Amino acid sequence: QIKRQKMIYHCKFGEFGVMEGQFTEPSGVAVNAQNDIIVADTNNHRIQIFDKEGRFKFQFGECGKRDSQLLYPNRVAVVRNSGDIIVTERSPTHQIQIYNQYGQFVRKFGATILQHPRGVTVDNKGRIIVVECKVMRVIIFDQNGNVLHKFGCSKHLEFPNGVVVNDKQEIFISDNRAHCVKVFNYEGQYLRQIGGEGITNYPIGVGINSNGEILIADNHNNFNLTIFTQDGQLISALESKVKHAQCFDVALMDDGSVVLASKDYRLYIYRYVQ
RNA sequence: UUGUUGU
């Protein structure tokens, strides 16, 4: 058994509700280049943007099925070099909507292709990667909504709930029921495993930081954060002080921090390096 | 509209 440094959060915001700064269901969280916190407020049909200190900035998306209208947004990603926000809509829309940094509509696509989007992210070539649970599929789009890659992996995925990529076309997916992160390439080849049972049980998300370290997040008792090299060599392991409710999503921030979206309708900002 | 686990 491995020894974990203790970690605590230094910021916390949000509460149940329907007004600014309030959440019905904070299903997805993403961080942009100025470390704003973008939240998918699913049952409120809106995306909410805060600064790195939980301060509400603005919001966009009203109920509906046409342009400039979100129904059930569950996950978000950010195009870092543009500020654009990538939104995935749950059933019955099952599609992707792209908004700019100002919350204005750009385009939407993928409704005839997506079914169960459970994680989304963007690579350095601007390509959008989506992972789907229940059916176990990875689909990769360009910014214009053209499908570039599609592959199933029901043989290798039990419960995919998060995704990031590096600069080498490798895809890192957290598998909640495999208790690890599984690595694939864009062609669908199953490369390797990072983490495992006993060290990263029931992961709830995965991240990659500026050092190119793979962070696996779980909530199997405390809120645990296990940090690996891209090979799977263990670097660092941490556990929180508090115990949390169910957790939706995690997102990394510039200065060695993680945003943790909880069932208790509050986002918690942990720091994993002093 | 919604597959985490921690009875």
Domains and CATH numbers, chain A: 1-274 (2.120.10.30)
Q: Which residues touch strand B (CB under 7 A)?
A: A 25, 27, 42-43, 72, 90-92, 116, 118, 133-134, 136, 158-161, 176-177, 201-202, 204, 218-222, 243-247, 263
d(C-alpha A109, C-alpha A145), whole Å: 6
Query: Which nucleotides in chain B lie closer than 7 A to a protein CB?
Result: 1-6
Closest by CA position to A267, among listed A42, A26, A44, A31: A26
Q: Is A96 helix (H, G, I), strand (E, B) or coil?
A: strand
Residue A234 CB neighbours (<10 A): 14
* Both structure tokens of A118: 């459970």
Q: Is A44 helix (H, G, I), strand (E, B) or coil?
A: helix
Kind of pairing, strands A128-132 and A137-141?
A: antiparallel
Q: How many CA atoms lie within 13 A of A30 on its CB side?
A: 30
Q: Is A1 helix (H, G, I), strand (E, B) or coil?
A: coil
CA distances from A273 to A42, A148, A155, A253, A267 (A): 31, 37, 36, 12, 19
Closest by CA position to A199, among listed A244, A161, A237, A250: A237
Tell me the resolution in Å: 2.6
Q: How many CA atoms lie within 13 A of A222 on its CB side?
A: 17
Nucleotide at minimal C1' distance from the A91 CA: B1
> Can you say how many angstroms the Cα of residue A264 is from the centroid of all Cα atoms in its chain?
18
* Both structure tokens of A96: 């992707």
Could you identify the residue written with the tokens 């203790």? A6
Long-range contacts of A169-175 (CB under 8 A, 24+ apart): A169/A123, A170/A230, A171/A129, A171/A138, A172/A206, A172/A208, A172/A214, A173/A119, A173/A131, A173/A138, A173/A206, A174/A119, A174/A203, A174/A204, A174/A205, A174/A206, A174/A216, A174/A217, A175/A203
Nucleotide at minimal C1' distance from the A201 CA: B5
d(C-alpha A180, C-alpha A204), whole Å: 10
Deposited experimental method: X-ray
